[PDB]
Amino acid sequence: GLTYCTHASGFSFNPQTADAGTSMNVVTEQIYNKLFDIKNHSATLTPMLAQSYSISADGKEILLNLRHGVKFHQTPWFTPTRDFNAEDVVFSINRVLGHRFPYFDSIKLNEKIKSVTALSPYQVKIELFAPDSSILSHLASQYAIIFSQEYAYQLSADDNLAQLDTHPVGTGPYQVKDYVYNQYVRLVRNENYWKKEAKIEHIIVDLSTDRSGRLVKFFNNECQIASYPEVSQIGLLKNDDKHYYMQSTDGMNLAYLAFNFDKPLMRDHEIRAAISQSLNRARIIHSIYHNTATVANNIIPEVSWASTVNTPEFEFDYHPKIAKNKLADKNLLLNLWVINEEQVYNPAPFKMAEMIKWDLAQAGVKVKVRAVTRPFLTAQLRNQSENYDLILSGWLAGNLDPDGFMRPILSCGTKNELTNLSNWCNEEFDQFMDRAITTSHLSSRAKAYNEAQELVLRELPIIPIANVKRILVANSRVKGVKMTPFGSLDFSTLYFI
Template identity: 40%
Template structure:
């Protein structure tokens, strides 16, 4: 198991611009038709079922897909989405959902639906994840990280279609967190009809790369590492979206994104560099939105490798890190050192939990008692910023400096995406900077995906 020592609960930040101009490669009329949303990241696929984290889950999923249930972003209560009503039976072991009628799938250049969303689509979407014998389970790999970490496939006894607009999930045992897992962005409803059409053309892999959902916007154009253009779904069941199109600009990071905001190329900037917030707060053209985030940054330690299999060594590392300096140098007052794996927004947060206080003298004493004078460790670090860590490499350098003061040499190894995931899965690392974000405040959405034994493999 990997021990989690450094816990940083982060606030999500969004900035909005009131007047702007756009670069010509994204069309000069975009501001009359919609807006430009700037964020750093690269989607490996558009289907969040197969995503571990990042842009697909945080941003793209909500535009393309709907879920059975939603979560109110302010009070974190369950809301109805494609499931209009639901029932909980058998003391929480059976869940029945009544689906909305007249919900249209998107009509794209690669698929034209012939019917409305129904129970077949819901059955397909979840059977693909949970049934290893399903025709689409192994398409584009057989990893569904969020649900694999929960071991939810083993918990589900059956998924049954009662009629075209009613379905039933039966669990092997009651589970109070089940509804919350269906409400995350990892649980989109896909089109079974689209999947059948792809099978007939032997193009099954396109289901995750050329998306078809019921969401408010549909994919129109994607240029790798540049931008994603969405056009509105004119038959969207909640009503006509107010904008004709949205462009997600992927082309700049760091100060480059701030420059795009200042010059008017961006209307909305997600997760701006925290060290620029003072400048932006004082500019009357911008509106800053700041609210507690359901996310967490952490330093993960590989306890299968000596000397990290010794809990006292891990404690020394935790004591040697100057958390307050990280809060100021990385987050500029938009985060707090977390005393537990659960953020404050979770209903299960323990108000009495205490943070690990910075104490390098105690760290040295522990290492001396263990007879350790020098130690050398590798630290895998993602290169791209995330909602939970706007500057991973700088974070790693600060940790490197802190640990050097107590005799621990850290070799920083930059890595990203599947490369980092692969090396972590191989368990050949010592430390890795990571994080987690979800739209559910149920503690199970943090505890099992991060701490369970199944999460190591997923």
């Protein structure tokens, strides 16, 4: 057995309905498979539930050839009577097309895909409205998990369709044995997996502790891997210890401040720029993240294939004297909302808020900080009653296609209320993004994404603060631990020496 300690914050057996950009979803990446995985900087598609695919010459039709012989989990709540096939893919993709899903609604997946049909039991046809170079990447994201149509059918007969997300059935290398809300998930190896079996038979995912206590549990041998350690407690760790080791990874893990474009005073570009210039972001990174983050003058991370070498100068970096000149006379009062949760991209949200409140005080701007819960925030956004000026947030992604993160955060939409906290709509921005998916040439796409990014850093609908590393500590008895920019920890490769 191995115990893996992580945060309970926004844990779910279903990321399609969870909040976008908050989690690598370590548990559901073990129990469900996708049609493809992307594992590398180059954006190679690894065949998973699809063995292969073709694209039509006009680029509007994709054929998925599904792997034969794949089994869904035999659990106490479900006995499958057929193998995975096209019906499962059609059910799964059709559900999110709507033929509330925050990620898919934020990318507007139903304005990309026209239909999804089974040509045969082992071949699916996707047709698009127009050529779209992003589609296969979205189907390789953590959100695009394939469910069991047979299970969903059985449950619909007796009304219990909610149980799809409470008692999971997947094709992945682990299955759910049992769990206790906010305490633990017990995983057991799938003995009928379609690829190399997981080496460790039993895995407990411990959710029951805050950052402080996770290293306590680790050194008291209550868990053998521990995610997202406290940052002051990394100072207590060494690299050359025989008994444990650390790993850390870059990726798409961004803390940022969004301006509410619904507030008339936030529309003034002079105000946003001066507010950006009031912030001592270097002080913030040093003081909150220590060494686990760098100041972010870019939306697109350097590990992304879309990243343009030459990180320029940010025109609105710390300059407290210019900020004070522009702001002091306006007698500004800003409401700053902070989400009261553990966040992969911000270890001390309130402490960061207070530092922002301080920096803006020096520029003569009064800030009232307001702690808020995810449920409260979610309700207000769904209800369009949100009345913040600033909100402190972030984005986490294992998918480094900018269509999968820049679009949810900043694109026009009516059904992107959970992800676009700026309430920002810019036609010029949206044209860059739409151009970026009309070609399959990486450099061509990158150019379009860099033009979009450059526009964002001029307009300042958000202020980027920090690119945050993901860290874990592992017990030296454990091998096969690979932390990567490109997804969650794969439990199936863990083993004991």
